[PDB]
Every structure is written in structure tokens, then in C-alpha cells.
Amino acid sequence: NYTEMEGKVREATNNEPWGASSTLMDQISQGTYNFREREEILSMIFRRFTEKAGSEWRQIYKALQLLDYLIKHGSERFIDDTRNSINLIRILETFHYIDSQGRDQGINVRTRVKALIELLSDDNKIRAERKKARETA
Secondary structure (H helix, E strand, C coil), X not given: CCXXXXXXXXXXXXXXXCCCCHHHXXXXXXXXXXXXXXXXXXHHHHHHHHCCCCCCHHHHXXXXXXXXXXXXXXXXXXXXXXXXXXXXXXXXXXXXXXXXXXXXXXXXXXXXXXHHHHHHCCHHHXXXXXXXXHHHC
16 A cells, blocks of 8 residues: 555556646655655656556656655665666666557657766765755746
């Protein structure tokens, strides 16, 4: 049974066609500022990456979007945590999938994942994207 925070992450990465709300993402970001919920969020987000998928591309895409937001808004400790999983994230760099509609869903996943990894591994980029985030906020 999912805790409240694991439920929020689940919802933010569910199978609905539309993206998660920025407010829901912020709520989850708040959870990165305590140890328990930081680990809850972590588990939940990467669970998604590990199910090599066809139509589960969307849940993976939404997990990437969330993780981008969290790197820009979340606790510094959460970036530290996430860095310990770069290996697992890298797996997505080869994600390929065209759906039954003839739509290439994989190209979005790969381009998002490449951007996130560039972000995660660069203190200068992180510092800059954090600055911007909190200015517009």
C-alpha cells in the first residue's frame, strides 16, 4: 500500500495521456526535503525505468519530466541520491519505440534522458537551472 507521497509520485507518473500538474510536482519536491519521503520518491521514480516497455513509454516519459523538475526544485540531497543511479538512468539512452499508431515515442524519451544526464552531471548547469527556477517562482 502506497504512502501518501508514493501515491503522489504514482499519480504524477500514471498512464493518463496528459502530463502531471506543476503543483503536484512541487508537492513532491517538498517531500525531497525529508529523508523518509526522499527515499520513497526515489524508489517510485526509478521503478518506472526498470520495466523495459512498449506502451509504458508514457510512464517513463512522465518519470523523466518529474525528475527534471526535482533536480531544479528539490533538495540538494536528492540530486546527491539521484547521482548514485546515473547507471540505471543511462539505460534509457537506447529506448526505442514506435506505437501502434505509427508514432515514435522513443525519440522523446532519449532526448529527455540525454538532457537530464547532462544536467545531473554538471554542477554549473544545476546551479544555473536552480537559479532560474527560483527566480520565475
